[PDB]
Amino acid sequence: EEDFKEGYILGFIEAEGSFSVSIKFQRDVFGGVRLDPVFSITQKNREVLEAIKEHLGIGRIMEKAGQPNTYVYVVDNFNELVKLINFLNKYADFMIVKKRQFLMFREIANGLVNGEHLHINGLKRLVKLAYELTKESEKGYRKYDLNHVLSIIDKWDLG
Amino acid sequence: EEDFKEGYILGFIEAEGSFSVSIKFQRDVFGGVRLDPVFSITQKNREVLEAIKEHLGIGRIMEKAGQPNTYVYVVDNFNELVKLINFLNKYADFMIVKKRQFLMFREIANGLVNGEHLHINGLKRLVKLAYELTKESEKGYRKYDLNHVLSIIDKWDLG
DNA sequence: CTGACTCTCTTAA
DNA sequence: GGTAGCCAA
DNA sequence: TTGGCTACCTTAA
DNA sequence: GAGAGTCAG
Ligand SMILES: [Mg+2]
Ligand SMILES: [Mg+2]
Ligand SMILES: [Mg+2]
Ligand SMILES: [Mg+2]
């Protein structure tokens, strides 16, 4: 049964999967702030990343910078992100370890997938949701605090 | 599906599961050397460990020494170890990341279960298989090298 | 504006 | 993610 | 001899 | 496990 196989992935994602939304300051972007969603799984054994990549028909594999002979399975473009999300909604309910992260991650991805960040308030909202997301993880951090980012969005608006 | 749930576990085990066989020098044991098999999964989210434990009907949960507020799901007694192994043999075929570790782990666990370590040569073989196991691991280590352990067994045999 | 490659930072395995 | 010490059972 | 709680060591997430 | 820079597209 491949249901078992899909249980393998979801189980694998709960253990070593990663839902992240970076904030990149780009002057030519609306609001002067960009949100960049990135789902990924790191692994020494390139093999498993290959299966998953093949069973989901999305994402790419690479060498993890700074850690030679280690690989990262990544899926970040909007199109593949939707498929990824489509996939997880199916079992989201049994998601134990990372249910919240995903839910918050989906909310942001979809939000961008619906151009919510195309207006000031919309952008501020997603940015806030990104910081909430960080609060959910142990290994995450932020270069600048929320108010700082928000004050940059306001500066841009005055333009 | 209970099958999907079984895939969640196997996937979880491949990512963050642990198959270990410690060597402990105990002067009153046969060969002066003991091999101690331990399967375990560490996790901050105690919840997920509770499920797995409740689903495998075996193992225990504890806080992880040195890492307050982090938990470890451990299954090490011979009885539970067999059930654990019985479980994994089922899907052992699809195991990608840790297939070898398990196979080598099982060989040792079983070997002790059948008292193979009760005769010198038998004990020596399992000890060797343990070092092979460490070779398969990235985060493992040995306090003493193999020849040293083997020379302790020989010393004890003279007595 | 988004894609994606390069690089950086943290700790739970 | 993996080892090893100890002492009771 | 094995159980299992305590303490220690490493890096792949 | 997770965040940010840069520049081509
Ligand atoms: Mg991007
Ligand atoms: Mg792993
Ligand atoms: Mg034991
Ligand atoms: Mg891990």
Summarize the structure.
Two copies of one chain form a homodimer. By secondary structure, chain A is an alpha+beta fold. Chain A is built from six helices and four strands, in the order αββαββαααα.
Describe the overall structure.
Two copies of one chain form a homodimer. The first copy, chain A, has 159 residues and is α+β, with helices and mostly antiparallel strands. Chain A has a single domain, classed as Homing endonucleases (Endonuclease I-creI, Roll). Chain A has helices at 3-16, 46-56, 78-89, 99-113, 120-136, 146-157, and strands spanning 17-25, 33-43, 60-63, 71-75. In chain A, a hairpin with a 7-residue loop joins strand 3 and strand 4. Chains A and B meet through helix 1 and helix 2 of A and helix 1 and helix 2 of B. The structure holds magnesium ion (MG) (4 copies). Residues 15-16 of chain B line the site of one magnesium ion. The first copy, chain A, binds four DNA strands through residues 15-26, 28-30, 34, 36, 38, 40-44, 60, 62, 64-67, 70, 72, 74, 76-78, 112, 118, 134, 137-143. Chains A, B: Mg(2+) 2 binds at residue 36. Chains A, B: Keywords: Endonuclease, Hydrolase, Metal-binding, Nuclease. Chains A, B: It holds the Pfam family LAGLIDADG_1.
Search tags:
homodimer, 159 residues, alpha+beta, Endonuclease I-creI, four-stranded antiparallel β-sheet, 6 helices, 4 strands, globular, binds magnesium ion, DNA-binding
Number of helices of chain A: 6
Q: Approximately how much helix is present in the residues of chain A?
A: 40-55%
Number of domains of chain A: 1
Strand content range of chain A: 15-25%
CATH superfamily of chain A: Homing endonucleases
Give the SSE string of chain A: HEEHEEHHHH
Helix/sheet category of chain A: alpha+beta
> Which oligomeric state applies?
homodimer
Largest interface: A-B, 26 and 26 residues
Count of DSSP E strands of chain A? Answer: 4
Strand order of the largest sheet of chain A: 1-2-4-3
Can you summarize the main beta sheet of chain A?
4 strands, antiparallel
Protein name (chains A, B): rRNA intron-encoded endonuclease
Keywords (chains A, B): Endonuclease, Hydrolase, Metal-binding, Nuclease
InterPro entries (chains A, B): Homing_endonucl, LAGLIDADG_dom, LAGLIDADG_Endonuclease
Binding site for Mg(2+) 1 (chains A, B): 15-16
